[PDB]
Structures are given as C-alpha cells and as structure tokens.
Amino acid sequence: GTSNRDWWPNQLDLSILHRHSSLSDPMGKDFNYAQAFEKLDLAAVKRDLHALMTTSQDWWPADFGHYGGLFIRMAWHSAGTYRTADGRGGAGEGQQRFAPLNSWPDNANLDKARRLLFPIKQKYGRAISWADLLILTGNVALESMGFKTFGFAGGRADTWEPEDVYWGSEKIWLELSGGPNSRYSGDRQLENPLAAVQMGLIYVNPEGPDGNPDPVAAARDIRDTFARMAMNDEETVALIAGGHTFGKTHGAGPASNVGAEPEAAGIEAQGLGWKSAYRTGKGADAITSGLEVTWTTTPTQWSHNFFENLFGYEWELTKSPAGAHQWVAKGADAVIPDAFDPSKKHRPTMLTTDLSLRFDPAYEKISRRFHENPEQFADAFARAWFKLTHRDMGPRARYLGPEVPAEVLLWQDPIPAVDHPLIDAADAAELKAKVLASGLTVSQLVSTAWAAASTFRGSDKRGGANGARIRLAPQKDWEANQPEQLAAVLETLEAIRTAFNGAQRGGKQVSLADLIVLAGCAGVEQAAKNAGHAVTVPFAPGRADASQEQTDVESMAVLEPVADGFRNYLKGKYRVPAEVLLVDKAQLLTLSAPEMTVLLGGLRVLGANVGQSRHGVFTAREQALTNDFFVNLLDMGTEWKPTAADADVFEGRDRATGELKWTGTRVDLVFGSHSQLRALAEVYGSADAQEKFVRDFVAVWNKVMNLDRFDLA
Amino acid sequence: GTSNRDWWPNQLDLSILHRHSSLSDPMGKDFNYAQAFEKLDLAAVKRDLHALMTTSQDWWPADFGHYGGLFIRMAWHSAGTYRTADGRGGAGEGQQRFAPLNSWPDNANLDKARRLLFPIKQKYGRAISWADLLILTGNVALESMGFKTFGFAGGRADTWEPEDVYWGSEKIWLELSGGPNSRYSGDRQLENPLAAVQMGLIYVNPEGPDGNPDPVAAARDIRDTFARMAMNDEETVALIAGGHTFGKTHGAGPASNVGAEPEAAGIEAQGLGWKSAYRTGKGADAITSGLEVTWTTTPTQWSHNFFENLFGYEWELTKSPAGAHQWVAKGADAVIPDAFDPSKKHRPTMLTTDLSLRFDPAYEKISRRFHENPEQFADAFARAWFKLTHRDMGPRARYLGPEVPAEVLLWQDPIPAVDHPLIDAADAAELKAKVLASGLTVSQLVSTAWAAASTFRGSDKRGGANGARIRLAPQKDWEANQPEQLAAVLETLEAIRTAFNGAQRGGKQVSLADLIVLAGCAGVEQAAKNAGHAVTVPFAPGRADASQEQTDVESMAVLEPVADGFRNYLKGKYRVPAEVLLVDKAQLLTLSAPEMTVLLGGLRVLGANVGQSRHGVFTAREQALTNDFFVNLLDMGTEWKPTAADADVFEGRDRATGELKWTGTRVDLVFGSHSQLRALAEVYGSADAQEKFVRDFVAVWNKVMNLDRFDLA
Numbered sequence A, B: 001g002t003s004n005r006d007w008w009p010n011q012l013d014l015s016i017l018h019r020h021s022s023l024s025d026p027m028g029k030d031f032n033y034a035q036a037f038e039k040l041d042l043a044a045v046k047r048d049l050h051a052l053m054t055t056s057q058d059w060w061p062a063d064f065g066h067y068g069g070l071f072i073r074m075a076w077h078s079a080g081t082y083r084t085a086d087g088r089g090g091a092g093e094g095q096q097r098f099a100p101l102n103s104w105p106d107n108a109n110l111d112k113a114r115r116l117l118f119p120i121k122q123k124y125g126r127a128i129s130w131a132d133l134l135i136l137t138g139n140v141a142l143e144s145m146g147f148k149t150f151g152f153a154g155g156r157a158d159t160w161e162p163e164d165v166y167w168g169s170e171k172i173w174l175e176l177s178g179g180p181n182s183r184y185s186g187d188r189q190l191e192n193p194l195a196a197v198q199m200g201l202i203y204v205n206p207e208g209p210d211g212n213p214d215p216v217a218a219a220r221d222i223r224d225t226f227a228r229m230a231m232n233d234e235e236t237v238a239l240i241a242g243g244h245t246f247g248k249t250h251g252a253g254p255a256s257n258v259g260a261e262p263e264a265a266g267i268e269a270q271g272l273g274w275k276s277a278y279r280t281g282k283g284a285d286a287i288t289s290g291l292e293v294t295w296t297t298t299p300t301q302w303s304h305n306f307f308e309n310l311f312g313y314e315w316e317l318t319k320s321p322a323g324a325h326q327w328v329a330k331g332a333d334a335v336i337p338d339a340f341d342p343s344k345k346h347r348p349t350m351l352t353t354d355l356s357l358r359f360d361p362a363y364e365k366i367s368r369r370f371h372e373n374p375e376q377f378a379d380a381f382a383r384a385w386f387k388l389t390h391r392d393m394g395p396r397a398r399y400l401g402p403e404v405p406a407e408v409l410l411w412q413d414p415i416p417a418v419d420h421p422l423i424d425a426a427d428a429a430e431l432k433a434k435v436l437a438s439g440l441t442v443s444q445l446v447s448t449a450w451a452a453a454s455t456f457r458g459s460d461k462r463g464g465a466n467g468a469r470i471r472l473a474p475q476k477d478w479e480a481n482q483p484e485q486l487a488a489v490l491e492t493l494e495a496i497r498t499a500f501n502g503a504q505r506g507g508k509q510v511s512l513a514d515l516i517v518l519a520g521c522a523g524v525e526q527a528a529k530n531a532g533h534a535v536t537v538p539f540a541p542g543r544a545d546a547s548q549e550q551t552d553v554e555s556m557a558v559l560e561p562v563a564d565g566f567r568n569y570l571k572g573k574y575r576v577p578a579e580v581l582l583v584d585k586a587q588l589l590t591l592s593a594p595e596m597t598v599l600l601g602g603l604r605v606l607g608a609n610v611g612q613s614r615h616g617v618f619t620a621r622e623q624a625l626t627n628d629f630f631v632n633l634l635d636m637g638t639e640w641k642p643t644a645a646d647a648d649v650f651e652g653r654d655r656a657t658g659e660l661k662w663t664g665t666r667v668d669l670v671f672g673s674h675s676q677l678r679a680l681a682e683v684y685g686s687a688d689a690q691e692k693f694v695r696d697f698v699a700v701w702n703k704v705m706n707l708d709r710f711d712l713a
C-alpha cells in the first residue's frame, strides 16, 4: 500500500512526538514500575540467574558449560548503542528486544541470550523489567566468574515500541564507508550524532577499519567511537580487556550458512533468527560474528590472562574458518581450552582491535600499567562497567534497590542533598512579587528560566534546571544563553535570594535553582496580567545548587543547544532543515505536537527569541501572553516570500498594498504550511481560544520546568 | 534516515492501532464535540456562509461571481472517498484537510475552497468542526442557488492526523491500468476494497476509462464505482446530473503550467498548492482538471437545463485547451455564459461521463424520466445528496441539530425506538441464570454474542449487536456465523425470552438483541467460575430488535467477515497475509494492540473458533477463562514448523521427543513472532498475570458489546 512517506518522503514526521501512548502500553495507567521493583526480592532473582549460568539448554548449548560470556556481551550491547551527542540509545529502555536492534548483525545470537532469560522474567513478572534484567544478568555473570562489581541500580521501566532514532542513512547492512550514503567525510570524520563506524555495528569493525586489519588504524576508530559514547582512554582499555577476559567469538564455518535476522525470519522461528545450516547450527558449530577467537586460558573465570597473552606473545595475521581476519600467537603451545571437547586445546588468538590496545601508543601505556597492576585493572573495569550500564539512567534519584553504590560520581551531574526547610506558598508569592518589583522584564524572566530548564533530554535524562548549572561553566557562556544579559539577570536574582535567605529563621532558605524557575513563573504570570488574565503558574520547590567542582565541563558540552527553535536560534548552517531540528528538540523535551505548538507560539510573543530578533514575533503587544502568533500567522491578508539575502528568512507583506508587516524563519512558517501543524494552529488562532491558549501554555511551561524533578516522582 | 519499514517492508504495522491518541489531539480529553455543537448558532453560521458565496477574493476569484459550484464540488469530494467494502473514507472525519487527500489530483484547487472558509471556522471555533463545515457549506451553496435540500445533521468530530487507509499500491499518481501494481485484473475487475479507477481520483476518469472517450464503457466504470460507494442507478444519475447543473470545469491552458500539490509546495505557499504559471493563474485563466466545460445556461441557479442540453443536441468529440477529450454540441448557438467576460458566450459542452447518462441504456431510461418529470429529479437529487453526505455517520442517534430529517431511511440501518421499561439488575441476574440452566455451553454463548457484536466497524459506525440482525438475512446464513449452531442457540434464547416477557407486568420486556449480549456475558462469567475466579461482567440494556424490512440485505453483505482472526476464520485464500487482516479487523473494532491481544487469547480458550477448530486452542481446560494461550504459546519446550499439506498451518512439537502438542495458524503464531506482539504476550503469560488477564479480558469484552451504543453516548 502506498503511504504519505512514499509520496512526500521529505515532509516532516510528527509521529515521533506521539509514541508511547497509554494505548500501546499493556500495563494499567496507574502502574508505577518503581513501586513494583522496590518490592522485588532482588536476592532471589540473582540466585536464579546464578543457577542459569551453568544450566545449558540443548537448543543453544553453553560454551565451556557456562553462559557468562554470552550474557556479558548481551549486557554490553544493550548499553553500547548509547551516543552522547543526543543521549539516544543505551540500555535504559530495553530497546534490544525491538526492531531494529534486535536484528542488527552485531546483535546476532543475542536473541538466544534473551530467550534464555524468559523463564526468570516469567517468574518475577512486572516486578523486574526486561531493561533492568538485561543489565542485572551481566552483573550476575561477572560475579559468578569471580569479578566484584561496583554495584547495580534498578529503575529502567520497560517500553513497548521501537524508539525513533537516526542510526544512519545507509540502505545496506554493514556498508563500508565511501558509498552514496557515507557516514564519513573529510579525514575520516564520522557524522554527528552517530557513534559507530558501519550501519548495524555497536562501535567498530573487529577486523579493522572497513575490514583492513591494521591495529594502529583500528585504534583511531576505537578512540573516536568510545569518546562518542562518553568513555575516555582508561575507561576504553578497561572495558575492552575486561570483556575479553571472558568467553569466545563464534566463526566455525562460512557465514553463507547463516539465515535471516529475526525481523526477516519466518513466523515459525518464533522471534529468533540467524538459523544456521552449518553442521549442528549451534554450540561447537556456532557462527555469530564469523571470527573464531578465545582470549584466555580460563574463559569462565576472571583473571589477568588477557594482558599476559597480549604482551607475552607476538602475533600473526590469519583467517577464521569463515574467512575473517584475526590473529594467532606465534610459536605458542595449545594452552586455551576448547568450548566442548575436553581433549582439545588451542593457541592464543586476538582480534585486530584487541591488538590496538598494545600498538596504539597511548593505549599501550595504560595496558601496561593494567598488566603490571591487575588490581588497578579490576577497579577501573568495575567503575567503567557501572558507568557503561547506567550512563542513560539520569539523576541518582532514579536509582532503585539495595545495591546502589554510595560513591557519587562526577559523570552523574550530581545535585547536592537538601537539608533545610523549603519555601511555602506564601514565600513563593512574596518572592514572585520581589522579582517583579526588581525591574526584571517578562522577557528577561522567561528567557532565563527557558535557558535553564530546556537543556533536559528524555533520551538519557540529563539536563534541566535542577543544579543551577546555568550560572556555571560552560552553560553561562553558551551563545544561545546570551551571556551578558544572563549575567545581569543572575546578579539581580542572587541579590533577591541573599536578602530573602538572610531574613529567615529556622534555617529555611531558597536555592538559586528554585528561584530561577520561580522567577520565570512570575514572568509568565505577569505576561498573562498584561493581557488581562489573572493566572497562577504552579511551582514546586526543592531544587538544589551544584558547584563548579561537581560539574564536568567537557561532558556538559553535548547539552549545548546549537538549534533551539523555541528561541528561533540556529548556531550555524546545517544540512537538516530547521523545522526538522525543532521536532527533534520537541522529542527530547518529551512534548507532543500540540504542546510544541502552544509553547512556541507563546514564547514568541513573550520575548524569548535569542538577540531580540523580530522573526516570528507576530504581535503588537510583546510581553503579553496572547494567541497573537496564531491569529497573525493564519491571516490570509498576508502573503509570504523568501528574501533575496537569505532563502530561510521570509517577509510577510499585505497582499493588497505590499506593505511589510512581519518577518519569519522556517521554524515560524512551518506552522502555517505543514497540514498537521496548521490544523493545530487553527485551534489556537480561533476566536474562542484565548482562555484555552493561556491554560495550555501555563501547563506546558510547568511541564518543562519539572522535566528533571525525579525527586518528586 | 533508514527506518524499520525500509529494512523489513512487509512487517505488520501496529501503529494503525494507536492512532488518534489523546497525544496528537489538541482538545482536552474531556472535550465533547456534540455538546459544543448543540450550542452553536447554526442559523448565524448559515447567514455567514450565504454572504461568503458572493464575496470574491482576488487570490481565487469567484466564477460567475458566485463560489457555489466550487463548494458543491468540495463537499461532494469530501464525501466521495467512501468505500462500502470497509467503510473507510467519506466526509465524517474531515480528512480532506490532511495528506494524502489534500493533495490528490482530483482535489486540485479545493485547497482554495477550504481556505475561503477559514474566517468562518475562526469565528465559531470548536463549536463547528471542519468536517461539519465542509458539508454545511455544500448545503448552503445549493440553497443559495435555489435548490431546497432534504436536511443536514451535525456531529462529525474533527480528527487531527491522517487516517490509515489503503488507497491502492500504485507509485505513480493517476497511473492507467495494467501496470506493475494494477488495481484491475480480468475483465475490468476492480480490487476490493478500492472504489476508484485510478490513484488520486474520487470515482472515475472524466475523459473515459484509462482516457478512452467511450461513454458506454465509461458508464460501466461509473456504475461499479458508485455501487462501491453504496449508490444505485437512480441515485447515481441524480447525483451526477444534479451536481453538473452547477458551475464549471477549469482547463484554460496546458497542465504543464500547474506546479506542486500542497504537500510538495514550498513553505511560503502556506498550505496551498497547484500554483499556475498560465496567464494570471486563476479565475478566467484557472486550470484544475484540464477540461473546459460549462453545462448550463445558468450555472449559478438550479434549472432543468442539464437534461435539456444532454438530449436536445448531438455531441461531437473535441479537445479542451489543455488537450483533454470532451464534447461540444453540434450546430448549437453560443448560449452558455462566460464566467468572467459579459460579452462572451459559449456552445454547450459535456464530459464523456455526462454522456454516459444518455448512452448507457439503463441510465438513459432514468435520465429521460428525470427530463420529463423534473420534480422527480429534484426529489431524487435532494435525497441522494443527503445520503452521500451522511452515509458514514452511523446510527441516527448520532445526528445533531435542528435540521435533521424526521424521515427514517433504509440505508441508516434503522433501530426501532424503545417504548417500554427496561430490565434492571435483578432481571438480568434471573435471565443469566435461566440461560446457564438451559444447557447452552460457554462456547455457544460466547460465539453467538461475538458474532452479533463484532460486525461493528468504526470507519462508518455500521454494524454491532443492536438490532439483533444476527437472526435475520443475511447475517443468519454467513459461514463465519455457523448457521446451524446459531439457529439452535437463537431458538433456545427466543424461548427464554418468550417466557420472561410473558411473565411480566407493566409493559416491561427484554429484546432479543439485549438477551444475546446478556447470554454472552453469562458465558464469560461461567468461564471465569470454571477457572476459580469470581467475576461479574457489566451489562447495559436498551438494544432493540430491527425487522427484516428495516434490514437491506444487499447493503448488509459488506459487513460479512470473510477474515476474522478472533475466531481463527478465513473464508478463502487471500493475497494479504492473515495477520495483516487481523490487525485490519482490530482497527475497525477500535482496539489497541494490548486489547486485540488479550481478546484473542481469551476467545481461543473459550471455544470461540469457527467449527471448533483446535488451531490456537493452547489449553487443557477449554471453556475456562485463563491465560493459558499465552503461557503455552511462549513455552520454549515447543518447536514450530509449517505442515507440508498447508504452509499456513503450523505444528508445535516437543523439542526433545518430537511428540505433537498443538497446531496453530499464522494468526495464532504471530503473537510469538512479531517483536511487539510477543512483548505483550509476555506480560499476560507471566506468573503474576492471571487476575490481570481476566480483568482486562472482561473490560475489552464489554467494550466490544457496547461499540454501537450511541443511545447511551
């Protein structure tokens, strides 16, 4: 059947904003996963997992009699999709069980790993999410094999449909770079927001870049892709060597024996895929990646044998039985055990990317340190494994259960505890009036609270107004935040704060994070008052202020808005049209299309634009909260054309006289062009809509102000 | 960006079931359009529409100074997409304002028509939907030009995204027949459920079939497409001649002058399209279809001139200025007015399809009668226009406002009014006990109520259990309904009913329609008891019994389920896979994916399959309401394979011994294969889910039993 996407493949896609409806969710609307998990007997789940590790099923026999390696790979691929550029991917939604990730070639045979866990999932039911279970199973694998983990937090609620993620534009799985849809340009520059080298890989190609078995060149791709997943050199070497202490790869025969991936398989396969025609199709005959490497002499026990082998042999380029490039130890004895036959042993083997840890000069230094000091290795791996598996979970207030590590880590963007009474409703009213009497304008108040709260992204639950990080580096100097104006507003608010807190007894005080949001609330109330409407904007205290020393400046860079349609801002010239970037930002904000539309229309007439641009400011009563944006955009008396100077700026002229009335960008005019957005604009631009517009605007403002408030969850 | 659809283009699409969520809807979840409409000053709206008719706008000047013909076309296109095969399309959701219909070639320049209406839409706001407005505007056009309409009902709630409809498989707009995705096969057989001859047409090609200007062959296409929109010969001739009493076509220059359709136009076009480079682009220079025909000597006044011209001249084949085939009256004088120049007149002209009304022998007779008896023409057209514009609105209980016609019409599937006391809860308990004491089984009770209720479709709100039409022709003889079993159940229920009604005082009685539903309820209650659960099923009385003479047998044929996955039924071999048909049916039933899943699982264990088929009956306790379907489907101890006899039937055998345990169809096994469906099955097949399964099943059972209960709305 031909679809709208077929006919108009470049039109903007609003359905990304309408996922995750209560319709698609089988749980009740009252289901609260955290409440279910907090009653789970986590110790009993772990005992069942521990038993499973050595309880081989004949339809996918356990290598060495132990599933630990397979489950550690499963948990590392679950977390491994994560990109710091947008926070999308990672383990936090259990997305490995849905398309497309369930069928990526790098996830081959993890369908078998997830199937092994269904009996446990079935026993415990809604009290443990798939998303938590995947991670927990990798921790229990590690523990079962003698490795002491750093801890574990539950709280990843399950999802029920695939996430909308840009994974690249290639139309061929595993396409080598340089094709018509190349994700590389320039001197091997990977396009943002991607974090893998080929479509359907986790990070890099285990043979080498585009299959070229050079460990030095492979190291460049390892470093780049791992940096794009928020991991530095130490963390990288710890993770790779740590993982490859366990288990083996599977390449016993030619890959042409392996059938359809799960989404393409027949119905009788009941959710599994890569059925193999080679010998038994499993166990000793398994084919997953096509490589056939076993790294250590004890694949089912933690050791420091990865580095002993890496450094204690010289390495020779060879081929697996599937034809893939891999390496074998020169002159070595057969000291590695076979996975099924106790009478067979094998020579040490390595992947090209393993040898990167010895041949790249910066990795070599760390690998050597870890080789000489395996206690340092164990500690770095444990910390990195925790970070890997929790990086998308958001603030530590979301972490559940009895194994949460107490140590506060800088990557968590930590918020200090609140240890004093909070302001009440009367205090909030007094502080709003003080803010308004200071002479700060609606535009200043709204702009500053917008800037603070709108760093949030639901993809990894980073950002938001909690922390008052807007006053710190690097946020205070981001161009979108209008540094000189921001500094003047923050100075006035800090004076208000000092005076209020100095007057209290009993230790009550207000944080600057709370006052920034409260001040934005006073601005919106004042704009409504300027329009003739008395409203109260809701406000919930309890935010705290983080220090510079608790803020990783380099990690914060990815939260910089380089495109923020809500402030009609674009930092420079992109390939993707600005309206597509607006929709992307609304998705990260967790907004629907109606929420996006109301919010943008109001912000324009409040004076939220960066630099006080007139683009889209379709009103003659700026700083009054009215539906004027919609009424004027919809006025057929105005004709619009692109300017000669700039095809992305439009002039609106009176159709009859030619007089200039307005200017706008693509982000403004999309609301009058897109057939779904225009239909929303019509509702708010109708003669009966002023009350509705104000109410809906206040509701979406308060939603944005509270996005990171998992302390009130 | 590559999407799951790109990778796996034949996968099933569940997002059709989660459309129309409260997320995409700008109105609050409590908004009730019926209540808004009932307060609308409909008389004021009509006055504004009357004024608009002759208020010409310079950007799309009114032909003959009067927009009436353009608006009649606009309303007839809004209604004209309707297909009786599935009830999809029609005017009832205002879908002409969204993709793809806003940009269909046959809808060219109706974007102008809808834009002219925005000021009225703006003024009245939420109190009149677009969908009602398009139809009311067509009514007012007719009345303004001297034609008295049969009536009008409001109540068509607006929708906020495109409907998921199969419009065909062609990838080229307007593709002629016989291509790689031909909608025709055999002797000009149109594929169900399509009701138009080419992609992006309303019904037929105005030049003739595939552009061949043969009026006799065109008549065959007219008759077939109109029948597939629920219109017979009389209604068809009345509609065509009636419409073509007004206005004109537009084909002033070559079609190569017309630019992009609205969904392809640039952002500056602000929602309009088909911008023309021919002369002024508009008015006298307009190009819409490419034809240039004006039918009558008074295009802005109702007249009997259509048939005078059709019969009073002989016709010669000619070309419009765009090169399209049309007809001109041989030897006629220049009697037709020009739309813009008072000094110009034109000869009478006709479309091929107009000439069909004279040259097809069965139409000719009707046309002549209308020519000779113009009052019969006026009456037929009035009634057909009402039917055209209301055929998708459902039961008369949904009709709102002060212009609703009192006359009850056969195509409304009318239900008699209830004029007696209804049964109360004590009566309901006594009747359930009687049903259970009669010896009717769970399987019999559930199957019969399912058969009665599940004819409903939300596309045109036809069908459902109200009316007890399951006892009448043709429902009582449908193969899916198991005619011999149905007859035995109905005979026992009618004897129960006769005995209850014969014992009452006052006028209290129970309809058979209510008793069928009630008896189904007692079945479900008994099945829960068989499983150890104490469950009360909600029941609402008030259904009435329709007569045979109130049940048009030919119109009822389209509700026949030829595929019903809920009863594992397929009437024959189709090209579309059965699991796609299941999803299609769930959409017509208004079900979400979780509802479809829970419903199907329960029906299988209750014995609702046609012919007592064992396929999907994954339980050892049939007629007990348990989650066994899910627990057994998910058991990895069973391996599944297609049979040699039949690739659509699957055997599930013990993995270790090979012993046969179950058989299933595609509909059954999709729940274990599709990655989304399997995620829902896992919830219900978990150890903690039995009570949830029961309660969710009772909820969705009750939902289906009430689909058509617009008397309680």
Ligand code: HEM
Pocket: A063, A068, A069, A070, A071, A072, A073, A076, A203, A204, A205, A206, A222, A239, A240, A242, A243, A244, A246, A247, A248, A249, A250, A251, A287, A288, A289, A290, A291, A351, A353
């Ligand atoms: C440069 C990064 C990496 C590359 C290129 C890579 C490559 C691979 C490949 C090709 C396999 C074989 C799949 C199969 O044929 O069964 C695999 C196995 C595995 N990897 Fe990695 N890997 C990477 C990093 C990691 C990380 C970070 C960890 C975990 C901390 C991990 C843990 C494992 C384990 C445990 C296995 C064994 C699976 C089994 O026993 O079934 N690897 N690796």
Ligand code: HEM
Pocket: B063, B068, B069, B070, B071, B072, B073, B076, B203, B204, B205, B206, B222, B239, B240, B242, B243, B244, B246, B247, B248, B249, B250, B251, B287, B288, B289, B290, B291, B353
């Ligand atoms: C065989 C069925 C029909 C065919 C092929 C058809 C074809 C068309 C065509 C090609 C146009 C010209 C579009 C343009 O260039 O502006 C048109 C105009 C129109 N049709 Fe039809 N028609 C059909 C039935 C109907 C019916 C059922 C109605 C209404 C009851 C209707 C009412 C009109 C009106 C009022 C116009 C004039 C528009 C104007 O004045 O702007 N027609 N028809």
Ligand code: NA
Pocket: A087, A088, A089, A090, A092, A392, A459, A460
């Ligand atoms: Na994420």
Ligand code: NA
Pocket: B087, B088, B089, B090, B092, B392, B459, B460
């Ligand atoms: Na419909």
